[PDB]
A paper describes a structure:
Artificial metalloenzymes (ArMs) consist of a catalytically-competent cofactor anchored within a protein host. With the aim of gaining better control over second coordination-sphere interactions between a streptavidin host-protein (Sav) and a biotinylated cofactor, we engineered a hydrophobic dimerization domain, borrowed from superoxide dismutase C (SOD), on Sav’s biotin-binding vestibule. The influence of the SOD dimerization domain (DD) on the performance of an asymmetric transfer hydrogenase (ATHase) resulting from anchoring a biotinylated Cp*Ir-cofactor – [Cp*Ir(biot-p-L)Cl] (1-Cl) – within Sav-SOD is reported herein. We show that, depending on the nature of the residue at position Sav S112, the introduction of the SOD DD on the biotin-binding vestibule leads to an inversion of configuration of the reduction product, as well as a fivefold increase in catalytic efficiency.
For simplicity, the amino acid numbering for Sav-SOD was kept the same as for Sav, despite the presence of the 34 amino acids from SOD in the 3,4-loop. The structure was solved with a resolution of 1.8 Å. Residual electron density in the biotin-binding vestibule was apparent from the 2Fo–Fc map and could be modeled with cofactor 1. Further, the iridium was well localized from anomalous dispersion. Unfortunately, the dimerization domain in 1·Sav-SOD S112A could not be fully resolved due to its high flexibility. Given the similar location of the cofactors in the Sav and Sav-SOD ATHases, we propose that the enantioselectivity of 1·Sav-SOD S112A is by-and-large influenced by secondary coordination sphere interactions introduced by the dimerization domain. Single-crystal X-ray diffraction data suggest that the configuration of the cofactor in both systems, 1-H·Sav S112A and 1-H·Sav-SOD S112A, is the same, although both ATHases afford opposite enantiomers of amine 11. QM/MM calculations suggest that the DD forces the substrate PDQ 5 to preferentially present its pro-(S) face to the Ir(R) cofactor in the transition states of 1-H·Sav-SOD S112A, providing a rationale for their opposite enantioselectivity. In particular, 1-Cl·Sav S112A yielded primarily the (R)-11 product (64% ee) in 78% yield, while 1-Cl·Sav-SOD S112A afforded the (S)-11 product (27% ee) in 77% yield.
Numbering used by the authors:
A (entry chain DDD), D (entry chain AAA): 13 to 49, 84 to 168
B (entry chain BBB): 13 to 52, 84 to 168
C (entry chain CCC): 13 to 50, 84 to 168
The structure:
C-alpha cells in the first residue's frame, strides 16, 4: 500500500530505488544500479494497486527505467513487475525484463530476464 | 523515436495502447485490454513508462517500457503488467515487447504470481 | 499429439527442430539454430510433453533443452523452450525460451536472455 | 561439473530434484514439487555444458518436467534454465517457465515465470 511503498529500497546487488507512491496509484522516483550502465541516477515511473486485497495478498506494482540520464545512455530499458509484501521484514519481490535497442537481426538476443528482491535495509 | 512512438497502437489480441512520448523520455497514456478485464472506460487503464529519447541512428530499435496497474474507477484485478521492448520505425512500424503480469498473492501462492508473454503492437489493426 | 509433435519444425528465425515424441512423454532429437552458436551446427535436445492432453481443444504442454555444446563448438550456454503444441491444418508449437550463459557471480544478473519462437511444419 | 551436478537438490519451496549428469551432457532424474503438484514424482530430462569454461564461470544447464505421471496430470510442463556453481555452498540458480495447455483464446495467460535456487542442503 501507499505508506508501505514510499521510501528507499535496496536489492541483493546493492542497487538503490527511491519511490513516492501517489494516492492515484502512481510511482515516481530515481533508480541507482550497482551494476552496468547524478551520473548514475535514472528517472523511474510506474503504477501500483492503490486498493489492494485485505486477505494478506501482496500489492501488485511495476515500474520502468530508461537507462539514459544527462550524462550517459545504455540504449536499454528495464521493467520490474512484482508485489509489495508489508510487515516487519517488508519486501518488494520482482521479476524484470531489460530490453536493449537492436537491429531486427539481433532482436532475438535483445532481452535479459532476472529477479531482484528489494528490502528497506542493506 | 519520440515522433514514432506517440500515437495509437494495437496488439495481436486487439488491445489498444494510446501513448504520448515526452521530450524528456516519459511515456503517458491509456491501455485498453481486449482480454482478462471481464470483457472476454470500463476496460481503460492509466499507463506510465520511459523510453530512450536519444536512440542510436544505425537502424537499431528504441528501448522502452511501461506499466499498467489493473485498477480504474470500475474494476480491480489486483495485478500489474510491465511491457519491455523496442520501437522499430519504418513503413510498418512495430513495438515488439515481452511482458510480466504479477498478481497480488499470499506468500503461499507467490510461486504462481507472475505470467510472462509477448505482444507485438502495430499502427494498423 | 505424439503423431502431431513427431517430425521437423522451423521457427521465425529459420532454425530447424527435429524431434521424436515417445509414448512415455519423452522428446529426443537435434536442434540447428540459424543464429548464434557460430553436423557442426546440430545439437542434442531432450524434453518432455503431456502424452495425455485435455481433449477439450486445449494445446499440449511441452518443453525441451539444448546445451550449446557438440563435437565442434561450445557457446557455454543452454536454452529451454516451454510451450504448447496446437494441432490441425496449420499446426504450431508456440514457445517462450530462457537462454542461460555460464557466468562469474559478478555477471550472473545478465546471464539469462528471454524470447519467444513459433515453430511450424513448413518454412 | 558432472560429479558436482549429480545428486539430490532442494529449492526454497522445499521441492526435491534428483539428477544424474551423463558424460555426454545428458541430465536424467525425478522431480517432486512441494507445491501445485511415486504419486508426487515426475520424470525430468535435460542437458548441461559437459566442458564448462575454466575462468570461474558456472556450468549452463536446463531440464524439463511434464506434470504427468502414472497417477496425476496437471496438463503443463516446466523448464528450468540456469547454471551450476560448485564449491563449499554449491548452488543451481534457475529461472523457469511453466506452460499450461490452453485454448488459443487463453494462450496469453498460458505461461508462469519464476526463479528457483537449488542447494545440496535441505
Amino acid at each position: 500500500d501507499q505508506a508501505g511503498i514510499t521510501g528507499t529500497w535496496y536489492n541483493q546487488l546493492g542497487s538503490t530505488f527511491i519511490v513516492t507512491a501517489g494516492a492515484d496509484g502512481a510511482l515516481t522516483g530515481t533508480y541507482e544500479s550497482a551494476v552496468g550502465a547524478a551520473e548514475s541516477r535514472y528517472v523511474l515511473t510506474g503504477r501500483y494497486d492503490s486498493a489492494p486485497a485485505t486477505d494478506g495478498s501482496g500489492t501488485a506494482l511495476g515500474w520502468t527505467v530508461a537507462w539514459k540520464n544527462n550524462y550517459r545512455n545504455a540504449h536499454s530499458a528495464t521493467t520490474w513487475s512484482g508485489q509489495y509484501v508489508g510487515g516487519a521484514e517488508a519486501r518488494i519481490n520482482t521479476q524484470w525484463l531489460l530490453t536493449a535497442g537492436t537491429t531486427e537481426a539481433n532482436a532475438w538476443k535483445s532481452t535479459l530476464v532476472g529477479h531482484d528482491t528489494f528490502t528497506k535495509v542493506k
